[PDB]
Structures are given as C-alpha cells and as structure tokens.
C-alpha cells in the first residue's frame, strides 16, 4: 500500500485490510475531522474504461444513506480514490448485539434502506451494484444507515438470493432487490436469517430449498405488528411480477409511521484530467 | 450445550438465544417492569453447584458500580440454577477500536477513565486480576457508550505481564494496571503492543518482547508528552516500579476533564437458592 500522500489535508488514521471497504486507507480531513476511505489501483493498463466508468457513475450518487465519492488524487505510483467512511462497523454486528431490534428500531433502519435503494434505482443501479446484503453504520451517537455501491472476512449468506434469480440467468435487479431488503428486515426482526437453518447454515441445498418454496417463519416469542407482518409477506414472494414493489412499499401504513419527512466537490473535467494523467506509469 | 426452556414469562420477554461470544452460551431477554435488556446463565442442578459457584456468585452479588457487569438476580429452574445479570448490548471495545482504525487521546482517554474508576473499585473489594475479564471490556447501548467490565465467568498474550510469565509470587493487582496499560495503547495505536501485527500466533516472539518491554508507538501517532510518559510508566517489567492505580489516578493526563462522579435481591433468597439447586431433578 503506497505512502502517506497531502499530509496538509489527511491525517493517516489506520491502514486497513479486510472489510468491504476493502484493502483500504483510513484517513482523518484535518478540517473536517472526517473520516475517510481511500483505495488506490496501480498507474498505468489498470487505469482503464469501466474504472473511470465506476468513478463517475459513483460519484452521480449523492443520497446519505449512501457511502459517497469524495474525491480523486494522482500520486506517482496509484490512483486513489477517497470515500467516505461509516465507522460504526456493520449493521449485522449491532444486531447480533441486540439479540434482536424492537419493531421501531427495525423500521427506523428499513426506512433509511429504502430511501437510498430508491434514490439508487431512480439513477439505474440495481442488484449487484448495490452490497445490501452488508450494509454499515456511520459513527454518529444516533447511527445513520450506509450502503456500499461499486467496492471497484465477512460471511454472505445465500438467503439474499431472490428465487428468481436462482432459478434464471435472466431477472430485474430491481425487484431482487426488494428480496434482499426483505431479508434485511427480517433478521433486524428475528435476528436471525430466514430460510437458513441456523443450525446448519452450511446446508446449502436445504437453504436453497427453503428460499425456492419461500418457507419462512417468524419465531413464537417474536412479536409484530399484522401491519409489519403484512409487509413481510408482501415481499417474500417467490414471483417477481407479484412481489411488493418499492414505490408500493413507499406508501406502506407500517413504512410511513414515524417517517422523517427528509426522506462543491471537484469539476468532472479534472477528474478525467487526472483519470488520464493517471493511465501512464512513470 | 443445548439449554432449559423460557421460564418466568410474565417477568421477562425472551429476547434470544445465544451460543458463544463473551457471554458464553446465554440467553438475552427483558425485564418487563425495567424495559432493561439482561443476559442469563445456567448452571446444571446438584454436583456442578460447587463453592466456587456458590463464592463467585456472592462476590458478584456484592458488585455495585457503573461501569461493571452487574449482578441482577438468581432463580431457580427444575433442571438449572438460572444466574441473571446486566447485559452489555455494545458489544466489546475492540470492535469500536476496529471500526474507528485508533481514536483520540480525548476518546481514549474518556474510556480509560471508567476503565480505571472500576479497576480501582474491585480492587478495593478485593477482587483482581482473573476475577476481571480484562482483556475483553464491552460497552452499553448508550449512544454515549459507557465502558463494562465482566467479573466473574461462570487471546492475545499482550495482556500479560511479565512477572505473571516469570515470576512464581505476584501481585494481581500490579499485573491488572499492566492489563490496562495495553488497553490504553490498543485504543491509540489500533493494534496491541509487542504482538508483531503481521505475526499476530508468534507467541514466541510476542512473549519475548513483553520480557524485554519492546513496544514502539507508530510515528503516525502523535499524543500528548502526559501520555506518552504514563504509558512508559505502566510499561515497566518490574511490578516494584510500576505506576500503581492511585499514582495514576493522580496523573495529569488522567485527571484532565475528568467527570467527578469518579434495591438488590436479598442475599438470604439468593443462599437459599443456591442450597436448593445443589439436588438434581
Ligand atoms: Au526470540
């Protein structure tokens, strides 16, 4: 990993290798005292089409809920890339350490989800763009949600996978998504994962089975809302064309409740500037 | 293994079951008439309920302070004696250590704080060394995250002091501040002393750079002359020449924005509970 570069705007916090933010910088903005991601791709052949196709693409996205593009440098050596950073750890691990979350908490989390899986919709990214299967937590007193989109350990669970998408090498991203989300919600709920057995999640055929025949079931001593449970079923719905959809979802009694009404950085010519002064390698 | 089934439902709402972590193999639930989230241990009926058990849970029942683990209450059940305490919903320090890369010397020093107001408080009770589990503090949920020392139980060697590796007699109460010394480092530098990060199962040589007090505090971090220095001062092989809980107490790095703040079960019921759970059903 290359050396320590602007020490006039980035403080070296950490160097990092093994989350979804990848093999990564952790840096400190001696202003902002923001923390933040930095990547870095070798000068020269690397510095190539979908590259800088990724770099622009990410950098259209703009919601919160969304772990943004800050900035691009040109060192010597690499090209690094500056993100922002959620350092309050995965979202799965604070609900491991809450057993399970309260239906409020749950549709606090799930209305952030929604939000920036719409706004990511509505600028064309579905499915394998958009890593809903782990999403983090900025750091703040009161967590804010963050979705990674575009990485250019950590355990993944086969129950993400809508049936669909089992079953086809064709599908809408889009409705897969809506799955995913519901998967989300679910172990937020129950905390645990529906479909897998949790007693032997290295059962794949088993998993895959449940997930193909939607056989789900919500513990006993859990307790929600019909209204929430409703919802649930709503999304677990093996074919697409009839799932709950997220507009539908949007106007959904239980997702309404309590929800918030909310929901100068560089000249894209410069960064193509840099893009192209970085494809040489000195 | 596997455990005995919900009891008390009208009391407590079960919350979930778990199978490892720091809380062992445990069930979470909720006390309805607190809205508090608790965690729950069991123990087997008859033999198993021997006077270390008996011992271990009076000397938790006697733990009053905020920022220990605390003892809730005992119960029991048919098949288990059901032991019901505080549940640190935060989860271990590390993982916040993890996340954040390393954190200030303010942030440090704000953990450190509580780290040694319960130290110095189970040490004046009479309970050091491996009574805590040290090397593996938790926090609360409290978005303001207070920091939670397990005592009693029912990794990386660089918790070990030096005399505890050589020595035959030793203080617990000496090697304890060196246990803190570490945590206080880890928290600043976002990896543990003497460990070789890139040789992480060299307990060779680990072990040998705890002995010859080898650590190095990365160019990249910068804290305070204050800190630095109380850090050489817990960082010493000799227990005789160790900072000791009360020097540090006074230390300026310690003291600086310092807060100043730094109904139980009957212990008859309690005794009496855990005779009746020494016969097996
Ligand atoms: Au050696």
Request: aromatic share 8%; glycine share 6%; with cysteine.
């Amino acid at each position: 990993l290359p050396i320590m570069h602007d020490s006039d705007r980035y403080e070296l916090v950490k160097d990092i290798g093994s989350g979804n933010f990848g093999v990564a910088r952790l840096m400190r903005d001696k202003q902002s005292n923001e923390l933040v991601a930095v990547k870095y791709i070798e000068r020269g052949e690397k510095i190539d089409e979908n590259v800088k196709r990724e770099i622009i693409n990410h950098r259209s996205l703009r919601h919160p809920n969304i772990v943004r593009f800050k900035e691009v440098i040109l060192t010597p050596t690499h090209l690094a890339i500056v993100m922002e950073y959620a350092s309050g750890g995965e979202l799965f691990e604070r609900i491991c350490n809450a057993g399970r979350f309260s239906e409020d908490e749950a549709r606090f989390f799930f209305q952030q989800l929604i939000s920036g899986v719409s706004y990511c919709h509505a600028m064309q990214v579905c499915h394998r763009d958009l890593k809903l299967e782990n999403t983090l937590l900025d750091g703040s007193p009161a967590p804010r949600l963050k979705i990674c989109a575009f990485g250019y350990d950590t355990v993944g669970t086969p129950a993400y996978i809508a049936p669909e998408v089992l079953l086809k090498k064709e599908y809408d991203g889009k409705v897969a998504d809506v799955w995913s989300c519901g998967v989300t919600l679910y172990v937020m709920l129950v905390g645990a994962y529906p479909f897998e057995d949790p007693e032997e999640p290295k059962n794949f055929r088993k998993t895959i089975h449940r997930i193909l025949n939607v056989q789900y079931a919500i513990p006993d001593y859990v307790h929600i809302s019909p209204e929430c449970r409703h919802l649930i079923s709503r999304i677990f719905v093996a074919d697409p064309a009839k799932r709950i959809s997220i507009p539908e979802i949007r106007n959904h009694e239980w997702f309404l409740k309590n929800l918030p009404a909310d929901l100068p950085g560089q000249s894209i010519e410069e960064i193509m500037q840099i893009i192209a002064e970085a494809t040489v390698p000195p």
